Amino acid sequence: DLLPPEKAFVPELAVADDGVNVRFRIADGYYMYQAKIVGKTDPADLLGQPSFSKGEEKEDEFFGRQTVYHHEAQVAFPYAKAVGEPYKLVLTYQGCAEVGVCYPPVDTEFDISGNGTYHPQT
């Protein structure tokens, strides 16, 4: 009874014309820090600042008061550049278990070449 992070926090990428939408599926008994969800691209700066779905507020033993996510987290990155070429998206996030321990920040890389849904490769 303690999931590998690969199973506690599962992101799915929806690449469309307006930008990249990320949905995290979050296993029962785990939660995610809104403030630790970050997106970077190579080439850099194709994406603007993320829009976040509504979360909850929690007094946390690690980072104090925080907006967190149970069950799911939704994050939409708008396009800041015209993108016609493939690029890499590096997603950073961090979640915890309700039992009272936290996973380290995790970086997950997506190789994007056009529209559709993308899954993690490892």
Smallest gap from Cβ 88 to Zn ion, in A, equals 18
Q: Return d(Cα 102, Cα 83) in angstroms, integer.
A: 36
Does 49 bind Zn ion (CB under 5 A)? Our answer is no
98 assigned binding-site residue: yes
Stretch in the footprint of Zn ion (CB under 5 A) among 28-36, 46-54, 83-91, 102-110: 28-36
CA 106 to chain centre: 9
DSSP designation for 34: G
Select the residue interacting with Zn ion from 9, 31, 33, 69 (CB under 5 A).
Answer: 31
36 assigned binding-site residue: no
Does 122 bind Zn ion (CB under 5 A)? Our answer is yes
**Edge-to-edge order in the sheet of strand 38-42:** 38-42, 87-93, 106-112
Does 110 bind Zn ion (CB under 5 A)? Our answer is no
Helix (H, G, I), strand (E, B) or coil at 35: helix
Smallest gap from Cβ 119 to Zn ion, in A, equals 6
Please give the helix or strand (H or E) that residue 51 lies within, else none.
strand 51-52
Annotated binding site for Zn(2+): 58, 70, 98
Annotated binding site: 58, 70, 98
